[PDB]
Each structure stands twice: as structure tokens, then as C-alpha cells.
């Protein structure tokens, strides 16, 4: 069911300049925000502290604060050590967290990417390079694996702390996590690249959670030429999706965009192409192109 992600983005431009920014996700809801200029980790949900006590949080936060400045310097030194093997600018990404399952089953991960390619993971008790990783990497890895303190801290976060913290998040934020927001659909069209043809767009917006079914229909039959765009986010934590069919001019009548979502009960949204409402909404949309 749920994946917890801590995402770190670290940028090193030269010897002097660097910033680190982090964001935390539970499923597709954002729980935390940690900006380079902020000394503290910012809550983005009221239930972001999960079930941890004020001082439990500080123990977690203080450890991270010390980690941020220590990682920054450790990277700089690693560049100094790799005298021409690698050089600035440097982009590093860390993805760390937990995938929660039923019964307290839980899987942890800490993945590291260098210049956009996945290269290093923490596995068991130590750092590891993954297949296709560049070979110069291993020495840094050896250097880093000689630090059993770091190893013990990471093991605690992955084995125990993360599965514990997210159990608390899933509780304290249950209502937010299980909320249902209804899709709103509207039609439009543009001319196709092919002469004598149109592309019909069905816009679907403001729905939550993510799963959704959006198809063009002629009655019972489903139009196989339906193309589904990517899920695009709204700023109010809802999703947007559009399905585009291609038709011969004059074939639009009879067609309908049909939407299935969990927030609608068993009441699918059937939007008929030439409907009373499509006619009216279209009049409010006219523009000079």
C-alpha cells in the first residue's frame, strides 16, 4: 500500500557554493519540507510529527541537522580525493524510506544517485555500488564503509525508526490519506494533423485518490483509439488527466467521455459530446486563438 520517501537534492557548483534541499512524501502526500536556509524541518501536514513526542522528534531532527552539514563537507573532501576522476559541478540525490505492508511487514531502502544515475545503495550493514556503477566509486565506498558509527545510525533509521514513524503517520493522518475528492470533467477539441480529422479532448480534474478510468465511448462500445495522458498534479493535492481520441470530422455525435472513480460511488460520469452542458460550457470558453 504505502511508500514513504525522504528525498534529498544536493548541489555542488564549485568548492565554495553548495545547497541541500529535502522533501518527504507519504504515498503522494507531502509531509515535510527542509530548505537549505531553514535550520529546522518544516511540517506541511498537521499530523506530520506522527506519534513521536516533542523530544523524540528533536532527537530525530538534531541527528538530521548534524547529518546535513557533515554530508556537505564529506562530499567536498571526496571531490578533493578524486583529484581528476570527478569534479564539480556535482548533483546528488538520495531516496530513503519505507514501503509499508499489512501485518507490520515493511521494507526499507536508501538509494543514491550521482549526476542523475543511480549508483549506490545502503544494503544490510554497509554501502554498495549497484550494477553499471562507475568503477572509481568503490574507493569512496571503502573509505565510507570504515565508519561503523554512520553504519549503526543508518541501520537504526532503516530497520526500526522509519517503520515506526510511518505507522504513526498512517494513524495520525488517516483521514487525509483516505479522503475522496470528486473529478470534474469537461470537453473540447482541436484540429488533427491529418486533414478531415479532429482530436477530442476530455479533461478530468480535481480527483483524489490517483486511480481513475477515462474512456471515450460510442454507447456500450469503448473507443480503442483513446489516448490517456500522464497524471498531472494540482496545487491543492488533486490530480488532472486528459484522454484524447482522434475522429473523422462529423463522427463526434454519439460519443461520450466516461469517467470511473472511487469518489463517485457507483455513479460514473458520462459526458456526451454534443450535450446541453457541453454546448453551454463551450460558449463560456470561446477565445481569439
Amino acid at each position, epitope marked *: 500500500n504505502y511508500t514513504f520517501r525522504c528525498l534529498q537534492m544536493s548541489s555542488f557548483a564549485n568548492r565554495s557554493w553548495s545547497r541541500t534541499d529535502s522533501v518527504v512524501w507519504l504515498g503522494d502526500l507531502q509531509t515535510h519540507r527542509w530548505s537549505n536556509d531553514s535550520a529546522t524541518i518544516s511540517f506541511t501536514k498537521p499530523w506530520s510529527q506522527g506519534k513521536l513526542s516533542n523530544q523524540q522528534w528533536e532527537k530525530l531532527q538534531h541527528m538530521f541537522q548534524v547529518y546535513r552539514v557533515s554530508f556537505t563537507r*564529506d562530499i567536498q573532501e571526496l571531490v578533493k580525493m578524486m583529484s581528476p576522476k570527478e569534479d564539480y559541478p556535482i548533483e546528488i540525490q538520495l531516496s530513503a524510506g519505507c514501503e509499508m505492508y499489512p501485518g507490520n511487514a515493511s521494507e526499507s531502502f536508501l538509494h543514491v544517485a550521482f549526476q542523475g544515475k543511480y549508483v549506490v545503495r545502503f544494503w544490510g550493514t554497509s554501502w554498495q555500488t549497484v550494477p553499471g556503477a562507475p568503477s572509481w566509486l568503490d574507493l569512496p565506498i571503502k573509505v565510507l564503509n*570504515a*565508519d561503523q558509527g554512520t553504519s549503526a545510525t543508518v541501520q537504526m533509521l532503516l530497520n526500526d525508526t522509519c517503520p515506526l514513524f510511518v505507522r504513526g503517520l498512517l494513524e495520525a493522518g488517516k483521514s487525509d490519506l483516505e479522503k475522496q475528492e470528486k473529478p470534474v470533467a469537461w470537453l473540447s477539441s482541436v484540429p488533427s494533423s491529418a486533414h478531415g480529422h479532429r482530436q477530442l479532448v476530455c479533461h478530468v480534474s480535481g480527483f483524489y485518490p490517483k486511480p481513475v478510468w477515462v474512456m471515450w465511448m460510442r454507447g456500450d462500445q469503448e473507443q480503442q483509439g483513446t489516448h490517456r495522458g500522464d497524471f498531472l498534479p494540482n496545487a491543492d493535492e488533486t490530480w488532472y488527466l486528459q484522454a484524447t481520441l482522434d475522429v473523422e470530422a462529423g463522427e463526434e455525435a454519439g460519443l461520450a467521455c466516461r469517467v470511473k472513480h472511487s469518489s463517485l460511488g457507483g455513479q460514473d460520469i458520462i459526458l456526451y459530446w454534443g450535450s446541453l452542458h457541453h454546448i453551454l460550457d463551450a460558449q463560456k470558453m470561446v477565445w481569439n486563438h
Partner: T-cell receptor, first 114, second 113 residues
Framework: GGIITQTPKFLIGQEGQKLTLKCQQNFNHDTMYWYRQDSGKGLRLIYYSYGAGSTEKGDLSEGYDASREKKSSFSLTVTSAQKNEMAVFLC????????????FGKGTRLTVVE | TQVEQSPQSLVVRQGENSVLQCNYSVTPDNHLRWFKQDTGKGLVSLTVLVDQKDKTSNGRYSATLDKDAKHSTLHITATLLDDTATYICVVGDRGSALGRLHFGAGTQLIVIP
């Protein structure tokens, strides 16, 4: 299973003279250091290196340059000796795979005579 | 600095026991170690402390570390004349060779016969 040796033990310099001192090490240590020991202060890093060709600035780099010709050897140079100077210079080497293993040499005494 | 040693100078009768203090503020504090420096010579390693609460010993040298109080004590049992050389407390901020050592200004021990 060896030593780290600083040459020379003692150094007679004059005001504004270039200063050179060596440090050799046979522990197979990739890292090497140059500290300065001032009376009542404790060690301050001047230069360090992760290998040959590598010379990295420490907190006390101004006034000095250093060069690492090879793994076994690390030179420090005093660019311009101060008029009243009296200093101790300590070299150290370390394992890249074990921070705790750090060895020091017996030091170098500098006296600038007018 | 970030490493304070106390007192600056210590006087002990030969045969007695001597105690040396070290306080620090450095972070992270991976390990603390103690050095002996004879006059006109280098630094000799006495003992290295790594754990949160740790105790180490090397011949007549023993030391304790408190991570929590950021405090360390060196003990010399049955002090000899040879114990004259100055005593330096050092903290290392990483468990990897990427770290840096933070040096205390030291304590001179004077052993009266």
C-alpha cells in the same frame, strides 16, 4: 611497520628566506599532514594531501606552500621566514581506511636568525 | 578552541597518581584520543576511546570517556619521572578518513622526585 621521518630536525633561517622541509613515511599511508605547534595553542593544520599531486589547504595555509611528489614523501615550504620566528613543524600520516591510525614524526625546530 | 584541557600545568609527587581533564564541544564526536609529547619530540599515542561510555588502558595509562558530558579523563598510575612530557587531547569528527582532528593545547605534567 615502519616510521615517519621529518628532515631536518633543526633549521636555521634568515628573514625573508625560502623555507623547505621534508617528511617521508613508509606505512603505505595515502594521507599526509603538516601542522604547526605554537606555544599554548595546540596543532593547526597547514596543508594535507590524499596522494601525489594533491595538496589541500588547511586552516593555516597562508604563508606556506606544499608539494607531494609521491606517496612516501611530502614537502612543506615556508615562503618568507618572519623576522623573529621560532616555530615547531609536525608531520603526520594516516590510513585512508582507518582514521584512528595516525602517526607523527619527531618534529622540526625553526629558528630565524637576523 | 573546541577542545579545553585542564589544568594548564599539573604537579605531582613521584609514585602518586595524576589526573588530566579534557572537555570539548566538537560535533560529531566519533572518537577521542590521548597523546604524549616529550620535549623536542613528536606525538606518541597513549590510548584511543570510541564508545559512548568507554574505558581504555595501556600499561599505566587509563582513560574514560563520557560522550554525553563531552568529557574525558586521563589517569597515570604510579607516576614516574619519565611521565614529564606534555599531554594532548584530540577529538576526531568522523569515523572515516574524511574527518578532521581537533587538538587541545595540552597539559604539562611536572613530576617531583
Amino acid at each position: 611497520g615502519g616510521i615517519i621521518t621529518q628532515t631536518p630536525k633543526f633549521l636555521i633561517g634568515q628573514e625573508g628566506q625560502k623555507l623547505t622541509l621534508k617528511c617521508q613515511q613508509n606505512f603505505n599511508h595515502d594521507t599526509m599532514y603538516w601542522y604547526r605547534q605554537d606555544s599554548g595553542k595546540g596543532l593547526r593544520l597547514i596543508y594535507y594531501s590524499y596522494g601525489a599531486g594533491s595538496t589541500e589547504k588547511g586552516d593555516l595555509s597562508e604563508g606556506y606552500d606544499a608539494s607531494r611528489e609521491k606517496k612516501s614523501s611530502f614537502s612543506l615550504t615556508v615562503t618568507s621566514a618572519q623576522k623573529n620566528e621560532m616555530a615547531v613543524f609536525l608531520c603526520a600520516s594516516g590510513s585512508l581506511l582507518d582514521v584512528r591510525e595516525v602517526f607523527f614524526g619527531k618534529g622540526t625546530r625553526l629558528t630565524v636568525v637576523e | 578552541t573546541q577542545v579545553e584541557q585542564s589544568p594548564q600545568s599539573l604537579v605531582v609527587r613521584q609514585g602518586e597518581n595524576s589526573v588530566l581533564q579534557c572537555n570539548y564541544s566538537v560535533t560529531p564526536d566519533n572518537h577521542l584520543r590521548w597523546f604524549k609529547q616529550d620535549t623536542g619530540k613528536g606525538l606518541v599515542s597513549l590510548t584511543v576511546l570510541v564508545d559512548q561510555k568507554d574505558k581504555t588502558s595501556n600499561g599505566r595509562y587509563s582513560a574514560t570517556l563520557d560522550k554525553d558530558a563531552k568529557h574525558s579523563t586521563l589517569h597515570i598510575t604510579a607516576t614516574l619521572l619519565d611521565d614529564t612530557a606534555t599531554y594532548i587531547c584530540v577529538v576526531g569528527d568522523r569515523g572515516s578518513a574524511l574527518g578532521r582532528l581537533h587538538f587541545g593545547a595540552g597539559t604539562q605534567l611536572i613530576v617531583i622526585p
